[PDB]
Scaffold this active site. Structure first.
Site: not given
Ligand code: ADP
Ligand code: ADP
Ligand code: ADP
Ligand code: ADP
Lengths: 458, 445, 458, 450
Positions: A17, A58-59, A61-62, A277, A280, A351
């Site tokens: 997403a 943050v997303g 590995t996702h 923020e 800056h 900073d």
């Molecule tokens: N963008 C997002 N949308 C849906 N799930 C997310 C999202 N970001 C993180 N996740 C969740 O976080 C888990 C892994 O987080 P991730 O960001 O990949 O870890 P890291 O940032 O350390 O690599 C996934 O299994 C997922 O369920």
């Protein structure tokens, strides 16, 4: 050995997403896995490796998985940590055979997590931090340069501090791709909050929207473990459906767990980071002789280095004048809170470093004509296996440099205190707006500064 | 195998290397005039330059002025195959070349070949022993060309193997003209420019990245329906194939460049004076190329100079800042080296050489030498190090104020040399000599 | 793997010109390859290794080959560089298997070139110069000690700076042979100019002699590429035979190519070096109480260290008095030009170092009773795997040592100024003669000094 | 399975010159080699593995052989070089078989030459080493067996080969000497005639550093200098030439000293001798030499393995016993000094120690400004004080040592007539022996001794 995802992974860009500033920019890595037979023989070349950068969960590995399943490609994962934990030798072996494992799957995506644990060398920890990083890393560095034409691969790297990596990984042939992800977005928060409410029902009234704004700062993996916890509220007593009053508490539960001594992003922690923020922002922005750029947000983690590092590894004549304001906008962050805030200071450091680094450069490595001349008291190297700073003046000339950088930063900080001070009305104006809406695009900024509203067609 | 087109009349600029190449040409032309007539010729020439400069185009272009079988082998393919088979491609290809005596045997992507478990080795050892098999009664000039000889296996540079190279300096305006005017035959042009003002409106642009401009210019016209390209069709041929390289290839601002141009004049002038003064000459501006050149004689610097020169030699370095300090809107800019190299003299000159400060004949430092490595070990009390330090501010300041003067007191030749440079993106020795000596230069040669 | 010369090499002592002070001294290494069956069983022993030392392209590899073909022996060559270029480990392997390659050919000559690239260790470059030199070298050092009786081998080494080598290579069992080659000689120049004019004819009038004197300074590989270029003058236009007016230009072409910014051995560069070499000469030579030796020439590269190093690795009681004049003759070199010359100074250093090293020894390591006593502020080691100087006094005692060696060298330099000054007439006398004829044997010297000629007969 | 020297093996201790020191120590092997029955039952035990310490050609093999000549016994021999030149297992076999051989010949001596080629520290030397070891590790109570060996450099000899039960004993054989040069040439006098004025008296002198072997070689050649001229009688001018001919060939690889060089060390080594010798309020020892190669090895053995718990007072004579080294020369010699470093270095490490590490109560007192890194393989001392305290220590050590050096200048000066006697006699006779010295000191000549 590592973590193999055979047969076919799930998780695709429909299961990811937001992340636009990444998705479309990654769509070209994807199509290489799809059709490498239309890349090898055409004339172009593909990354072979891409490091994406951001906070914890943050997303990353996702999205790494998401790229594999989208390109319908085997998914290879291995967290960096596993390669150093071992003795001197087996560090090297594990890498080669991971890449004689990934070679067999053409194509496929290898994905090392916290590669943070294999990239860095200088001369600091003399004893048991040298030969285990010297070896182990300079295997991946050689296996990656092994990917010629007819071997389709994408080595994806995750990392929470990009700057702590050896300047050779971002260098040619190896990990030559830059996408960080500022994911906790507004609309993103929704979509993530939506996508992760597929299982379990809700007899709601808030529409997850009024939860997004009630969880502004919040990552997705943060978000997921918010909902998943919300449900187990019910399954703890056996309740059909969970309210949005069961959801606030689900954010009042995860608000006090990230660590061991419980801590949060409080109405004063945002309110601080906001003034900070805005500082800056309100700094780098002037008229007549001032110097800098613009685009304002809250929650990046990494990005706030841009005013030097990702530019010294991109060569060009900067300027004594430019740098000073650069050093000004540096200290803006502090300044801000020094002023508005409870006249105590939050430990928000980088900073200062950026400023100080920028200013021993000022004196030594560059010739900026202090009391020190156009003499060269330093020599930042940029070599093909080595390539990092060390340098010789002499104890005395060292105090000499020290005193100097105290003088330089102090006095420059005072500058940005005044200009913040002098513009004090606008600080409240910016920070306040900032607090309230997370992100202002710089023309939006241009407005809020000249005492004018601009509302969203929402 | 047949007559391979493109001679030296069909390769723009790059005259420097053409002259050096007639050596291979006459021999490629009449090898019978060599073997018996007790001589010997290179055998393995490598080319030094970026991707798309004149490279392959020139090795080919020998065969066109040489009239010869220009054999080709792409180095990328030598490594992509299998065990032994990659080395085979070599062993067979070289048997092939023998029958076609005389000839040229070109290797592209020689990088993929010459680096330093099995892959690159296979082709490397094979490529080597076959070069190590070229006889007296055997005529054969191997070509190659790469962007980074820094990362090229030193064994591949041994005498008998690849023991010669010419650099091809990339653009230039008079070379950008030449090159666009060479690719003018194809399709028509009615535009005001005659590729004159294009060669300029394009700054750093290799030859290849111009053919690519012109090839695209036609596809900008005919897609709109035009048997005739214009300026507003050729300028757009730029900005379209200019904002895609920009993401990975550098560009400079009408200030950036106007700096380097004053900056590099400072230097030129610096090394140029009359009575009680000591230097050299020949000037340029090239975006990537100036990063490589200072480094080759930063390792392999060595003759036994004289004290006096070092002192001009130091100031010839500091004239780089100087100029800018004078002409420019009273700001200075990250341009470190000049100092660094000027300081290592001084630092050397005090400490290591015998130059008779307050320090005198003693050896406060020795030089760690030979091939692979070369950086100098220090040896003095902390005090003597303050001593050295102060020293080096003194010696260098003094010098820098020197060249500020020499520039100032010429500050009208500065903003001429700079100015013609800025304009014509390279002066050539005499060219400079003339610009200095209050005389215009018309539409040359 | 390396460079093998099977079947039978060409190049022999007939194909090697001059090099007498080497040829006859090598003839005993040769006869060991010829008949090792009359050396193993007799009672004597053979080098197993010989390092020859000189400039770039003096005849070194040329003589290395020459020894092989003369002894009718397989020729094994490998340039040192190839052994360090690799990682930590494969450095060691490449040596062993080079010597399991050379073992199979009994007998044969192994020839490492610029072994410069495997010998040295102290404590300077802590990071990436330690364990790759620690290992790799201490393989050849062990493989060479592997050559017992019934394994005939001669490991020949080339090197342009002999002094930068680990004191273990010149030590027992290993490379225990010392021949350097001052090859650019007068009669040598001829022979080399002759031997390399076999191919291509000449309708001459100079007889190569009047070219020898017109190329006094000049090495053989310098020479060869002089003639080979001379011919291509013709083959550039297609001319039958090349004149000696085509030969002068062939030396006016190679006069400006050795580097990247073109440099030479000018009528003032000889004229400098000359006064310089006459200084040392005219120094070490006195009457009543003075101390030193004699034999004068121009163009050695290495040799001019003799007044210490090849003697501290040969133990004996030297003397305060002796060393001071030693230190005097040291600075003679400078002195000279200081005087005669354009009152500017050419960067010709080693001398100073020799002097300075000799005089921190003076103070610290030896007991020479400065203001520092018979105290031992130093400990030059001479060990079996290690064995090089380091030492402890204390920062202050350090300025103390410094100031001292300033006083010592300054004052001693002044001495040698006067004595040169006071003998000024003789300097011109010697240097001038020197310039003109390259080499004076010391009795010849004895004459030119006492205002007398001595002309050459043949 | 190498050379089996059976029967009565000639050369006794009456046929080995000088080297008396070691002969005495060896009767211990001799009586046991003679009557082992007198040992086994009579509850005792004997060495088993004697190695010899000395250069090539001193008395070595000659002496291990010479045991068998006074012991009357099978002197078995095995050349160590051959143990490694062969093949895998086979090199180790040569050992396993050779030791089975020696058992049947009880009693005996089992000699190993080139023991170097055996005992160093992939497979080659190991093969023979582990085998040689376990066979020595198989010598029983009701088993009589004395293994011999001899090498020039025990510095590079595998320490496992020195373990108790294995090679746990050695005698050094000091190479030449004048009284040992006499003895040796007079032993090789039986062969052919001599009418020359010298009686190998003034030869033994006219030859300086000369091992025994490098004398036989002189005399062997002396005959071939006479008979090639046609002479059944060698002379001086035929024996002196037996020197300068086999003296200018070793000189290219073996050292020599000048009538100044030597005359230094001789004063120099007197300075020391006297030094450690005085009366009332004074603390030392005694016995003197001059040997070209040998004096390089000896200072190094107790430069590693130095240790008893001395007393503060002695160190202070002990420091000046060291400095007297310079001293002497400073006094007697043409007012110049010479690179002769060690003495200082070793004198300074005391002082440096004495301040810093021991408790000796300068201005520095009971603190431990330094500790000693110890045990077998390594031993050198870690420092730990502020820079200041290091000036402190430095100055200190100039002070302590200067003071001392001025001391021994005195002690020498105020004896500077015994000096240029001990030196002089030394210079002359190339070694004083304890009492000999005692006598030279005590204003008395010594006539043509023993
Ligand atoms: N963008 C997002 N949308 C849906 N799930 C997310 C999202 N970001 C993180 N996740 C969740 O976080 C888990 C892994 O987080 P991730 O960001 O990949 O870890 P890291 O940032 O350390 O690599 C996934 O299994 C997922 O369920
Ligand atoms: N000197 C030039 N004159 C005309 N065209 C050139 C010139 N240099 C390069 N080109 C163009 O660039 C193309 C390839 O450039 P080249 O340098 O030979 O390949 P590369 O640098 O990648 O090895 C040529 O086909 C030619 O059209
Ligand atoms: N003595 C000379 N006589 C003839 N040729 C020589 C002589 N000296 C050098 N050369 C030439 O130089 C080449 C090699 O030079 P060399 O001295 O062996 O290099 P380096 O000194 O670095 O080892 C030989 O191929 C030979 O042609
Ligand atoms: N003490 C001595 N008396 C007589 N001859 C001796 C003496 N020492 C050595 N030699 C001679 O030296 C020869 C060998 O010397 P030795 O020391 O036994 O061998 P190495 O030292 O090489 O092991 C003997 O054969 C003998 O002739």
């Amino acid at each position: 050995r590592a973590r193999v995802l055979t047969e076919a992974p799930k998780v695709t860009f429909k299961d990811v997403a937001g992340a636009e500033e990444a998705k479309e920019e990654l769509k070209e890595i994807v199509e290489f896995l799809k059709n490498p037979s239309r890349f090898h023989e055409m004339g172009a070349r593909i990354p072979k490796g891409v490091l994406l950068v951001g906070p914890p969960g943050v997303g990353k590995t996702h999205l790494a998985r998401a790229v594999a399943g989208e390109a319908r490609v085997p998914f290879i994962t291995a967290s960096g940590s596993d390669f150093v934990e071992m003795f001197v030798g087996v560090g090297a072996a594990r890498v080669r055979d991971l890449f004689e494992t990934a070679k067999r799957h053409a194509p496929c995506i290898v994905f090392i997590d916290e590669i943070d644990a294999v990239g860095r060398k200088r001369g600091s920890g003399v004893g048991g931090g040298n030969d285990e990083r010297e070896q182990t890393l300079n295997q991946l560095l050689v296996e990656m340069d092994g990917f010629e034409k007819d071997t389709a691969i994408v080595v994806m790297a995750a990392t929470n501090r990009p700057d702590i990596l050896d300047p050779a990984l971002l260098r040619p042939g190896r990990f030559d791709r830059q996408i960080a992800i500022d994911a906790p977005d507004v609309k993103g928060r929704e979509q993530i909050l939506r996508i992760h409410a597929r299982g379990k029902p809700l007899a709601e009234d808030v529409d997850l929207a009024l939860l997004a704004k009630r969880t502004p700062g919040f990552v997705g993996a943060d978000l997921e473990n918010l909902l998943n916890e919300a449900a187990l509220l019910a399954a703890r007593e056996g309740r059909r459906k969970i309210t949005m009053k069961d959801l606030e508490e689900a954010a009042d539960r995860v608000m006090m767990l990230p660590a061991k001594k419980s801590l949060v992003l409080s109405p004063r922690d945002r309110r601080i980071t906001a003034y900070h923020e805005a500082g800056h922002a309100l700094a780098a922005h002037f008229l007549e002789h001032a110097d800098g750029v613009h685009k304002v947000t809250i929650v990046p983690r990494g990005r706030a280095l841009g005013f030097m590092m990702p530019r010294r590894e991109d060569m060009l004549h900067w300027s004594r004048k430019r740098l000073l304001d650069q050093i000004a906008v540096a200290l803006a962050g502090r300044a801000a809170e020094e002023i508005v805030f409870d006249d105590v200071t939050t430990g928000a450091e980088n900073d200062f470093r950026q400023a100080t680094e920028l200013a021993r450069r000022m004196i030594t490595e560059w010739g900026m004509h202090p009391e020190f001349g156009p003499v060269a008291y330093a020599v930042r190297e940029d070599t093909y296996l080595g390539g990092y700073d060390v340098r010789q003046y002499s104890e005395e000339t060292a105090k000499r440099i020290d005193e100097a950088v105290r003088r330089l930063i102090e006095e420059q900080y005072q500058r940005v205190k005044a200009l913040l001070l002098e513009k004090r009305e606008v600080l409240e104006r910016v920070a306040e707006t900032l607090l309230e809406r997370e992100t202002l695009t710089a023309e939006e900024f241009q407005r809020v500064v000249e005492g004018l509203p601009l509302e969203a067609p929402e």
